[PDB]
Amino acid sequence: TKPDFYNEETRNNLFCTLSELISLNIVPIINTNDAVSPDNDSLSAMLAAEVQADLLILMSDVDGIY
Amino acid sequence: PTFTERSQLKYARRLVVKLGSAVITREDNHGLALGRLASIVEQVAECHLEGREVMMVTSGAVAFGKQKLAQELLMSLSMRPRAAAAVGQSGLMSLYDAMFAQYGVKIAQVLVTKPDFYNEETRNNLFCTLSELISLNIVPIINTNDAVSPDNDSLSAMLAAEVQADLLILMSDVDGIYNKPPWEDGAKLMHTYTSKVKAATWALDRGVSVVICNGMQEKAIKTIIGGRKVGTFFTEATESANAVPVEVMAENARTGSRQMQALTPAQRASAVNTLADLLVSREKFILDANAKDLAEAQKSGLAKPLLSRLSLNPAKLKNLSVGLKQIAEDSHKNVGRVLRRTRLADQLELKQVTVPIGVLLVIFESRPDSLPQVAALAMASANGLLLKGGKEAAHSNKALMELVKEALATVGAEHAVSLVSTREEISDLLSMENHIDLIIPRGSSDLVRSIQQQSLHIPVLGHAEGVCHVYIDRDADLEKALRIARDAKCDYPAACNAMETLLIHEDLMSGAIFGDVCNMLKREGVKIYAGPRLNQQLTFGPPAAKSLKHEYGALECCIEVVPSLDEAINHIHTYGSSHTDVIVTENDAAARQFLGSVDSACVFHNASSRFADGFRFGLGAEVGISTARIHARGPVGVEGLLTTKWILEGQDHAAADFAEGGGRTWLHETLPLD
Amino acid sequence: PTFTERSQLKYARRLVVKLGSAVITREDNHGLALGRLASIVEQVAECHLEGREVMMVTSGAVAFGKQKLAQELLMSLSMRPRAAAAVGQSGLMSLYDAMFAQYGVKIAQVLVTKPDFYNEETRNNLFCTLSELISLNIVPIINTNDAVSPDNDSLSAMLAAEVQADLLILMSDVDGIYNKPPWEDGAKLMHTYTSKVKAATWALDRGVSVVICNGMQEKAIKTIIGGRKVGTFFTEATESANAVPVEVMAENARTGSRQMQALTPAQRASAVNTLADLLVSREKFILDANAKDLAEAQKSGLAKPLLSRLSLNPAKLKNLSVGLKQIAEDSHKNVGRVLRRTRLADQLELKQVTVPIGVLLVIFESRPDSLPQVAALAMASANGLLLKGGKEAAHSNKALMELVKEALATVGAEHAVSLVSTREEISDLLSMENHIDLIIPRGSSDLVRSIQQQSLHIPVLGHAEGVCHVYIDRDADLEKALRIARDAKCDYPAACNAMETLLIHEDLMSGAIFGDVCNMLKREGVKIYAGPRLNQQLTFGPPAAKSLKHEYGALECCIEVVPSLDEAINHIHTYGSSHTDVIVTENDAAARQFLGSVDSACVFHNASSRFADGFRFGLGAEVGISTARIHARGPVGVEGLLTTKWILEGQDHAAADFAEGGGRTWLHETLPLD
Ligand SMILES: N[C@@H](CCC(=O)O)C(=O)O
Ligand SMILES: N[C@@H](CCC(=O)O)C(=O)O
Ligand SMILES: N[C@@H](CCC(=O)O)C(=O)O
């Protein structure tokens, strides 16, 4: 969830989980913990941020920006 | 909370399980022990299908993922934990889905963490999620968000807390809590209760009933929901003193036996005299008590056997009084009596004497008349005694108990007697050990049969079957046998010592005495069957016997005829319970033949089976009818409750002294025994 | 086939299971009983992981689909079978996939039908498919092509046939095959064997070993693969007569007991004389036999206790001969002896006499010296007898057995003796009933302990623990107790009757006698521990005792001191096994105190624990040391093998005759007993 990116200990934890995963040729599917939830795009963005990923693809319905 | 006893546990509407990390993983943490898990899910689906509300908290997903990879961990430990738990979380979820859906129930994964309980907005959120779920007949599985994790039991506890659930089940590996470390004398498994322990206190402090069972125990939930004494139950309700749980009873009784051990000379005698006097003096109270409890039984209308035997009249009390006075006057030299007097060598005087047994436990249905009888038996036999009747008579039992407690209080004054009321769970009672010696069931076949089937690793006096037998020989007077069997069956046909069979020489089919006795049984209205040989014999005659080892109790008596003495003997040994038999004849050659050949507990010659009464034998007041192959046969008086004890009073003797070195030889001179 | 006994079943390389349609569906055929199925898949995955080759044949898919729909069947039975089985086939397959893969094994559905076995081209095809599969470590599940179907057991049978598989397991609901319908006396569950029955014959005719177990029985495969006698095994190998499986032994012995019952007067006496003569006359044969078997044991080198006790010397044989002659001369009036002589009324002469027990079964480790001793006991006690030693001595046992069979053959001539060799599976042996009476273990703690833990619902003479105790009083002569305990421990310190403890008055810590006895034990090299109170007492002293209820056997003796007599008594009762104890003192007041208060099987006063030998008591030849609370205490001679039997010789008496109607009164005049 978004709060999980804000505290830093959980930042460490989740990043460790992700690194351990990717090291093992596994493609983790990253949903939000709906359970703890009152469109999840900021999530992906700041995710790539913490990961410092090469390229963020963001599919959608619209073809592009006019 | 509100619930106090395991009895209350059929009445909790909201439940929470939390499987332990050891009950599901096999003995590697490198796979999954499945059978246990299956048992768990089946029990849970059951309790839910009943209508109770359950929210599993399955610990230990790591094992699932660890097994599921098993290849990449391999190839990485040569070139290089939580992640395995994440992938296992997924897979395990699927597996639960399949299995639960096979009962039609649906489930839905839910992930939480301890911090998620601390902030209050998330408390609102998660509780809303749970309420919305439970409202929809879904069994949410509640794991921890490993992802956010550096044994998840506090979690379940405080979960139940926020939910304010009826009962928290907490399965585990250990069976329960002991008094002390197990490597220690006195590891009293503390079933109730006035780490896991802390968390349990905590949850109790949240007003929540907690229980900790053993996973490997079958049906553990269905077991524990029944109220069965298993695992460990927690409540400080501490309503009453309830002087003994079950056992300090037993130790006490041991103490009291040790006590009365030093009170032979007229002490127990005068004491039982006092008991008879209290019986004949304060009967008004106990009489009205039985009248009351009998009225209480009437509305129940249980069983004319019961509804007849729970009765009591001052005439019965006079009978009991005279029996007790008899026991008193004749119970003079039963204990401490020596049986051997021998000298092995100079100042080597062995002698073997009489000593009590210990902790006797009676069991019988509502028949308060026996209670003081067996109490007199105990007290004259100087050994302790417990009791357990049935449901009825309970108040009458208490009245008699107070009377006898007074009676023993006079001299010796120690209460080496008790009573285990309030549904002590007979099977659990006999599950005890190291205390109780002689189960003395007294009610009837059922009672004793249920006992023998339930009793394990404990001596059980008494029989269970009353298949007696009556042989008639070719040289036996006809009318003699006529009246004999007439009485044998028609004196108290529901007795134990009854002739649920009648065997006749092959020759005497000619004298139509078979017909005569059929006529007689008809006279008495006896539904007779026929033996296979007898089936062959006549045209259609009486109907065929169902099974030779059957029991009637009512006015029924199989009848069969065989060629020879020896054939009869063999049939007896084949079917007879070795309980009781009699022969009728005029040849003493055959008489002795039978006498020896037979192996019944007791055999007669021209008498009646109804003689097996002990009292009839001048054997004092009987206590039971034992058919076991040891120490006791049929009519057991008091001496069936006395063992021996070797004693020896040397001066300076030693073992190697009787070797070649010391001038110590052997005499074994049978001194005149006292 | 080739396999003959369940012993051979650790050596089958190709297996085939066929679950029954009742072991998996719950008790509705409207769902699925899962726990059983899980157990099955776990066992199967195990046997496969071992390296054996398995091909399940799961019956009963219909239940899966029936449950899975549960809605459309509902809505159609209001507006309107095989199809449900098809959809269930799919789902069930998936489920097996999940579960098996959780052990890492992979599977692959395979469908067949009975016609598919009949044409030969399809035989080729299917066999090719199966071989290709098994070659790839895959466990094919073999269902029938329901689609083409109008209980699929013939299928599995002939499947194994075409495969020519080692063993066909056929689980089911029934435990096994009986001699006859169960509603019938003699439902002998025929474990081996010289519908399912037919198909089993068939498969056997195809050279295939078949077994039919019970599904509900746990570990049934792991059980049956071990060779354990379970289910029903099938082979007509009929190699040897193997005169008794286990039981016709028992009945025979019963017959032989009945036989020797009529041979009291010097008959058994002269017979055991004959036995002693055969012992002293043909010893060369048995001596060389033991020499041979001892050499055989030497290469094994099992245990210096065993490797020492299996020995035998003609001196030992002389000892046995004199013991047997003693038993002979003194075993004159042990049986049939009357104990009571009483008259209830005119021609009412009850008397109670001595009778045997029945089928005694000894158990002991390799110690052929005891064998003839206990045989003499049996024969002088006129009751039957079985035997079971261990592994060694077996040939020696046979030699002794032949000698004694001769000895009994002389008079009476009936072989009321046997021997159960060839690994009769002691636990199964004691699982029997209705035949055996007295388990008489004789080896050592282990033996008897394993017994008591295994024995259920069967009398077991003997003890298991030798925790004795020695109290020393403040008024006891020092050197007296010195030599006393010296011997008590240092005569055969590995005995049962040993003082694995030593208790001392609190006062006598002052006279340094504690020090003196420590010195003495050192003299004898005894590793002494200390009691908690003693731990408190001195500076560091000897090390602390581990546990008070421990056992040493070797040169070890805990030592502890308490204040008072009564404290010692309580400690005894708390820890003592009530086996044996002695007091040393000069006060007889305290003497009697102890005497009474104590509850040991046997207690002494200034003697040695090593006196508990029975023979030492002039009690004839002992048979065991019993600590049970019934019928027998410690040294049990022969009379611990004699029960009683009420007999009664009336003329014309009846029950109601002693009622008010008939002039029959009560006397109970104690006639002078014979
Ligand atoms: N749940 C919102 C953000 C919640 C918040 O932190 O305001 C999202 O995923 O975009
Ligand atoms: N307080 C939690 C862990 C909190 C966390 O770091 O997530 C525990 O003791 O198990
Ligand atoms: N003969 C087979 C069925 C043959 C078939 O139609 O496939 C049976 O009796 O079960």
Numbering used by the authors:
A (entry chain A): 174 to 211, 232 to 259
B (entry chain D), C (entry chain B): 45 to 124, 142 to 211, 232 to 275, 297 to 776
Kindly provide excerpts from the paper associated with this entry.
The bifunctional enzyme Δ1-pyrroline-5-carboxylate synthase (P5CS) is vital to the synthesis of proline and ornithine, playing an essential role in human health and agriculture. The P5CS molecule contains two domains, GK and GPR, catalyzing the first and second steps in the biosynthesis of proline from glutamate. The GK domain catalyzes glutamate phosphorylation, and the GPR domain catalyzes the NADPH-dependent reduction of γ-glutamyl phosphate (G5P) to glutamate-γ-semialdehyde (GSA). Our results describe the assembly mechanism of P5CS filaments, in which the GK domain forms tetramer and the GPR domain forms dimer structure, and both domains form specific interaction interfaces.
Filaments in three conditions with (1) glutamate (P5CSGlu), (2) glutamate and ATPγS (P5CSGlu/ATPγS), and (3) glutamate, ATP, and NADPH (P5CSMix) were imaged in cryo-EM for single-particle analysis (SPA). Long and flexible filaments of P5CS were observed under all the three conditions. After 3D classification and 3D reconstruction, the electron density maps of the P5CSGlu, P5CSGlu/ATPγS, and P5CSMix filaments reached resolutions of 4.0 Å, 4.2 Å, and 3.6 Å, respectively. The addition of glutamate to the P5CS samples induces micron-scale filaments. Consistent with our previous study, glutamate (a substrate of P5CS) promotes the formation and maintenance of Drosophila P5CS filaments. P5CS filament structures in all the three states showed characteristics of double helix. In P5CSGlu, P5CSGlu/ATPγS, and P5CSMix filaments, neighboring GPR dimers interact with each other and form a helical structure. The interaction formed between F642-P644 of the contact loops in adjacent GPR domains, which appears as a CH/Pi interaction, is critical for the filamentation. In the P5CSGlu filament, no ligand binds to the GPR domain. In the P5CSGlu filament, the GK and GPR domains are likely in a stable conformational state, while vibration may occur in the GPR domain of P5CSGlu/ATPγS and P5CSMix filaments due to the binding of ligands. Although we solved the clear structure of the P5CSGlu filament, further research is needed to understand how the conformation of glutamate binding contributes to the extension of P5CS filaments.
